[PDB]
Amino acid sequence: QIDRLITGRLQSLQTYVTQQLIRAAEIRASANLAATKMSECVLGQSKRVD
Amino acid sequence: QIDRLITGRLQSLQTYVTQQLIRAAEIRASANLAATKMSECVLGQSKRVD
């Protein structure tokens, strides 16, 4: 019974860590975009449209 | 027997959803690139080489 609970909770924890890694990749992409906007719009004047 | 079938089909569905999330992240990156090209090549003239 404890083995059943262990494999269920381990599957839940692996699912949580996997979706956290995917969201971390998305947030890293957004933060790289934000650093690019910090460099190009705040620290200078950008010719790039929109 | 249904416990074995349920854990097999749930593992298959979780694998499918994880692959779909990774491919959706890739397509989101490609679409952000395409929106950048739409802004900077169509709506303006770009000095960025290639």
Added chain:
Amino acid sequence: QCVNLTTRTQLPPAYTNSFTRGVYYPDKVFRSSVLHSTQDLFLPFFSNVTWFHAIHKRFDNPVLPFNDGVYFASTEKSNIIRGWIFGTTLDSKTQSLLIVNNATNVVIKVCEFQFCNDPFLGVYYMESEFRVYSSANNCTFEYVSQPFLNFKNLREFVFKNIDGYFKIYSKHTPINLVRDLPQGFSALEPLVDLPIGINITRFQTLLALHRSGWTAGAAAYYVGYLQPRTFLLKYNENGTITDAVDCALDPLSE
């Protein structure tokens, strides 16, 4: 002792709206400022509840199927409704549960009773007439407790038979509405859990006569049936259930 009541007036039963009544606490757990979704035998919101009258000449004491549970609502003045009749065949072949509130106390007995065809109590204008049974042969459980009890009082009851446990939930509400069920919210507290362990498929209300033949005092009661469904219950800061959502009523509450 049994007496046939032969001065009744024939009338079909009525129906009315349940509104948002019949909610009770699903468990013994305090909850603070949280929304709790629970799966239990609940009474549907705005449902079709069977309406029975006692007025003068109406005296509604039939036997109805129990199903999975009974919601009993009582718009009561001068204490006409005194108890209920619980069993399967309502004879000495099976074992039946008796709930009575006479002039002194409440008595709960699980025995092999011989029910009358027309069981009632009686008040002489002083309670001096008990004709609800003729025998009591094999008792397994007896329990004497504190008394539970224009229409002035509103009495809600929920009876459930789950895993041999008899749950009685109740709430006392001061109302001033004349005829129908009032519209509002009141969650029923758990009063007493009974270890009965018996089969129950049919039920019957117990009324009281007024003697001064017989006269029926002005009373009205309501029977609703509990169905397995989901409620989203809202718990306030003080921990009382102030609002509920029936998840299968309409798509908005879904």
Added chain:
Amino acid sequence: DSTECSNLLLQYGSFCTQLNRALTGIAVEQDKNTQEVFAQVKQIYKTPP
């Protein structure tokens, strides 16, 4: 349509809700991507005849 399967599946909790939520997020993300790429103008311009 097996009700015994769903009764056993309710013992595993909210895995199915998680998968439906992830697929719904992907489904609205595709419409967000198309909205971001192609709807960069609020005026529908027309060429001269």
Added chain:
Amino acid sequence: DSTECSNLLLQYGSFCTQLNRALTGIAVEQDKNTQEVFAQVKQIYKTPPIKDFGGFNFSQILPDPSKPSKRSPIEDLLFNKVTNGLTVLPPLLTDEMIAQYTSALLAGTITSGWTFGAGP
């Protein structure tokens, strides 16, 4: 706290180590993200005490001296509008230091143009 559960969990190997290491990588990646976004200047600039900018008003974006958090009114409104083995690690940069970084960037881009981003 069940020791039999941990004895059975040791049969599965180093799954817990992998989960902890992945979460540690995410946790240091968040601090790296904040470092790359906000810490683009190594000089902490201040505006002059006299706000003579030729009619241009920056009071809604410059830090408010009356507030103890040293935030701008816009930043204060932004911070007001956002509302079992589990631990939450605090971020490496506090909100006061992120506000200090944004104040330095604002002072640099107001008093010095784009020159502070390319040199002195």
Added chain:
Amino acid sequence: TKCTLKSFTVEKGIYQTSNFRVQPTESIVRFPNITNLCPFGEVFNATRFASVYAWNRKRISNCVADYSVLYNSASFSTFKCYGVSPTKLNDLCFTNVYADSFVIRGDEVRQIAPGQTGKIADYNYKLPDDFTGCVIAWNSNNLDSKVGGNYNYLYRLFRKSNLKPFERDISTEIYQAGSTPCNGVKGFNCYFPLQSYGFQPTYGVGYQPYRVVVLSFELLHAPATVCGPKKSTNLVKNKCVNFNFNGLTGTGVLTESNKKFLPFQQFGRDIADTTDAVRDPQTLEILDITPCSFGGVSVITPGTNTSNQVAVLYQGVNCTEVNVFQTRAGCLIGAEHVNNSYECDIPIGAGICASYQSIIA
């Protein structure tokens, strides 16, 4: 840290190596009041006991039964169980108990047993082969016996067929010893089945009257109303203890609570369905259950090529519950806090950083 990293050399940085636990110190079991006791005083110590052909059957139900008082009594000369254990009667739960009380002879005390064949077993009181419960018997020569002979205790001597288990027979039909017709008329070979005992004070051990109470247990689908007693201990607050409240167990710090429960409510839950409030069953007071201060143990070190000095960070742990410095990240032990500001070398968190120059924070 070398054990965690599986290496003999440690690079400069902070490494989460272990998990600090506030170890539970005591065990607190609080169980409600032991009231509504089973009426064993009117069965074992009644005024007059019954005969064995008409043994009195008392139904013990809807009560808590203290078998430790019955078992620790030294007056009982026989305490033999055949389906349960005597030391586990206070732990097990049963639906109901049937108490069969009678008086027999001292030589017939062994005849109340499964598989035992005797006159009392065949004609007066029969036990099944799968009998569960305990037989209790004690001497009653000072009470039942009379100097003129106590003839009130009768017993059945003759019947055509043996008893079924738990079967009574109070009939007074005249037995047919031979094959002669008897219409209830006594003759040469027709005798009355119930004979009286010869209990006198001059008889020795074996002919003295023994009072026997036989407890039989039922384990049907009815709820187990009959349970053993619960030994509740004292309540200890403000410490990380193992609490056991009415079958709900756990580990936590039990502090006073400002949550006013409604009288029907016993436990309290937060949003995340964790028990954070509870009512003590002995005294109706509300207690908050704060989880013990678990934390992550992180080791802050430079390179082992540089130095072997380390600092320990207990994450989210106050410094009074473990060169001691309190940070918002937790308690940092082994680093000297300085008022100067430098660049971040080893990140601690919440604006705190550590460096080596000894280890300073």
